[PDB]
Design a protein around this ligand. Structure first.
Ligand code: ADP
Ligand code: MG
Length: 279
């Protein structure tokens, strides 16, 4: 599909840089016609076939197709798309309160502060999985807060660069994210489905409760090995006054066999809740 090929600067003014990827840079911007603010994500296109730099058109089209389907309080929405010879430019909903990642670097969290965040993440993922969309890159840097300076911040899931529609219950190959957060089936290059997201949620939950990463090794390869082996434990020093139900929630997500892992629907009914790979 093609996108609007007018100069984006004719319609938007750009401001501060909000964030950076290997092939993307995200800048605050303001639409001239409405004065509304957005985040413009500039994704570098492939310059050839078989070039390693930039993102393939097929991959950019998939990210755009998925973003266009989304409208939910806990996910990002897509406003407009532009393109030119070098970039595709996604005008995304602005999330102005920073990464959950940097929020956690400031603040440990109480179990209630952890569940406040987690319930919203689970609601956003329930929405996506209801659509058969696997996000495949869930981690604290890809959660954003609308406002950091409130006692119970609202979050939106961002970064659909690895997301895929799963229309057969699994897809074959193999959308490798960040070693600390990827499920064993990603590590082992096995068919992947919605369950891989649920593993990432267990990793995120462990970190929210402890400030520590459950599988992190000294090298990317050692982390990957730890993940495949399900090499983690609840350190007394971090978890001694965490509730057993919170540990139970994590244990049921950090399960090697995706068939045996909690589903997003299971996770919402759980008693605790129910009311870049190579060095
Ligand atoms: N809608 C948004 N609002 C505010 N900041 C954003 C938004 N989207 C992305 N960012 C920031 O930009 C960074 C990179 O964007 P991302 O979508 O993760 O691109 P990629 O992971 O493909 O490089 C994020 O980690 C975040 O800090
Ligand atoms: Mg990111």
């Amino acid at each position: 599909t093609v996108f609007r090929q007018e100069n984006v600067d004719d319609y938007y003014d750009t401001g501060e840089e909000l964030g950076s990827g290997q092939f993307a840079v995200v800048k605050k911007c303001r639409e001239k016609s409405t004065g509304l603010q957005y985040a413009a994500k500039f994704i570098k296109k492939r310059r050839t076939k078989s070039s390693r730099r930039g993102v393939s058109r097929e991959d950019i089209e998939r990210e755009v197709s998925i973003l266009k389907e989304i409208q939910h309080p806990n996910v990002i929405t897509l406003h407009e798309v532009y393109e030119n010879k070098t970039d595709v430019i996604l005008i995304l909903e602005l999330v102005a309160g920073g990464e959950l990642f940097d929020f956690l670097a400031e603040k440990s969290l109480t179990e209630e502060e952890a569940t406040e965040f987690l319930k919203q993440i689970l609601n956003g993922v329930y929405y996506l999985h209801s659509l058969q969309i696997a996000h495949f890159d869930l981690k604290p840097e890809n959660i954003m807060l609308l406002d950091r300076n409130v006692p119970k911040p609202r979050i939106k899931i961002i970064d659909f660069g690895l997301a895929h529609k799963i229309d057969f219950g699994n897809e074959f190959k193999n959308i490798f994210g960040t070693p600390e957060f990827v499920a064993p089936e990603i590590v082992n290059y096995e068919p992947l489905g919605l369950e891989a997201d649920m593993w990432s949620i267990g990793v995120i939950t462990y970190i929210l409760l402890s400030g520590a990463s459950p599988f992190l090794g000294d090298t990317k390869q050692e982390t990957l090995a730890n993940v495949s082996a399900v090499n983690y434990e609840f350190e007394d020093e971090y978890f001694s006054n965490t509730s057993a139900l919170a540990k139970d929630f994590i244990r049921r997500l950090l399960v090697k066999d995706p068939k045996k892992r909690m589903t997003i629907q299971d996770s919402l009914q759980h008693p605790w809740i129910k009311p870049p790979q190579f060095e």
